[model samples]
Target: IDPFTMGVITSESEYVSSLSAEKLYRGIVEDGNIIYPKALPRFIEKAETLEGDGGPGTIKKLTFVGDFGSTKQHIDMVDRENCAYTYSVYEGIALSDQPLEKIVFEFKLVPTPEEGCIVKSTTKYYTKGDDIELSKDYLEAGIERFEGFTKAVESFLLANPDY
Candidate 1:
């Protein structure tokens, strides 16, 4: 068996929001630090930029509430023109308890034909070894979390239009 042929688990999710694509993209990618705390105060204790200036090499640390601890992600790409963002989570309990190397998350906000936007998200789990297998429940839980986070941001943007 070839180790390189081993699978890298991937999960995808989509959320529709009433906010414009540009606004939603700006809220989630550009003003994350400002909006995250306001949108998910109970879950996210802090969202800080550790290094760089919101560019590809930027590193962000998100401190969660209680036992969830914190996670550090390195920004891989930020395409403002396309309303796309990509980052890789390399630290925290997310990887500690699992046989994972890193999780890469890609987000794209596409403008709908109507007035709203469709937020598309994809998560790729890189395992530590070739034979490692991830359960469906585990993958679904991650999707749920991402949906919850997106909903929170959407609600915040809806309530505060000027933001």
Candidate 2:
């Protein structure tokens, strides 16, 4: 269980709508494009395609930037049924020469009595000595990323509702 179960650690309590469980799983499982009716958060698709080869040991390349520098991530596998995905980075590829081993993200969804559902998005990045302090800025950027992405999705849904 996450000790920082609340948003105090990484804004877990109030993430953008698009980062919800429904959108995250739907995007990865269905191979949704860069954008969709729901919304694709910044984490969903960077400047690259996420529809990598199915199953384990797939070579899914990823890239992102931060205050230190830009880094590339190697996605090892995606578990559709369990709604869990894992990835890592070799030495020298990420912000540090130390390998970013086993970055896992999981999602869970529970239907509400109302018109929507409750989504739980969780991430576990395994890297000893990684600055949790820096994570604040990173998450801020992450949230902004979703905000923009969700707005884009809203625009598309408005423009193309018949699809």
Candidate 3:
């Protein structure tokens, strides 16, 4: 049950959207290419699609492997109706070669007041051994980056009605 010494940490980003949940979900999950052109933040550098299925229960691999180095992730648990998904990092140079095993990001977007949506996210890190301690600074940085991603997507949707 207890995997990462740091346990699990969750964060949320709330957006007052003029778009419906269906549009938001479609743009983010269905038309993923929208992110690179309109939503990805500056810190991301660039992302390359290694393999993709564009659906639930499928392993869509993406490599953000430039400038800041390389990391790969597999996507799963995509529920279009609920606007939820999970991405797990199984192999990556970013792992620092031991102690940490995987990093899982589970995201949910739910309809809220005034036709807005709230993105709830949970990040869980699994470690190889109990003796190892995960760094809080690293996890905090990830949370902050994800917040940037969500914000960027919101901006993109607001700007591009055609999306």
Candidate 4:
């Protein structure tokens, strides 16, 4: 009846009627806010200081907190091999200086038919006390971000022909 009580709250949002699973998957990975609002939005802007081929457990530096903030998240690698993958920022990078904490999120793609698929974005929040209740913006902002991302994907599909 209650999923949030499970020590983790998993919210999934999907984008159907997609063109390519691989491309869709890549888009999810490349997209920052799809995973966490506090990721880029909370901080302001983030650039990949370093990134690998991008596989499981791979590390990347995301300079959050904007032009002069104190955060550069070390993004954990997701499942780049498949349409679905995850990443976590439990530690590492400059953001460690803050009270914020997070984990790897997933954007899982399930095929429906030709030019049809869905993107499921998952973000797991690790926070504390009354802080989580008071700071709803970080989590809620991501919902709107994901919706925008889905629409963006739809637009991309309309513009491009088969991958």
* TM-score, cand. 1 vs. native: 0.91
Per residue, candidate 3 scores C-alpha lDDT tens digits across 28-128 of 66766546435765545444456767664445444353565555657768898788878887765244634556777777777876666776767777766
TM-scores vs. true structure, each candidate:
0.91, 0.45, 0.75, 0.57
Q: Residue 9's C-alpha lDDT in candidate 3?
A: 40
* Residue 6, model 2: Cα distance from true site in angstroms: 22
lDDT tens per residue, model 2, 1-163: 5343211233332333323344445454344343442344334434343445545554443334333333344565566655555444454422333333334443344444542334545444454443333345554553454334434544454454444
TM-score winner, 2 or 3: 3
Candidate 3's TM-score reads 0.75
lDDT of 2: 0.43
The 10 consecutive residues of candidate 4 with the worst lDDT sum are 92-101
Alpha carbon RMSD to native, model 1:
2.0
Off by over 4 Å in 2: 1-11, 14-24, 33-52, 62-102, 129-135, 139-163
lDDT of 1 at 145: 81
How badly does each model clash, as a count of residue pairs?
0, 0, 0, 5
Best by TM-score: 1
How does residue 28 of candidate 3 score in lDDT? 66
Who wins the lDDT comparison?
A: 1
Candidate order, lDDT descending: 1, 3, 4, 2
As a whole number from 0 to 100, the lDDT of residue 7 in candidate 4 is 29
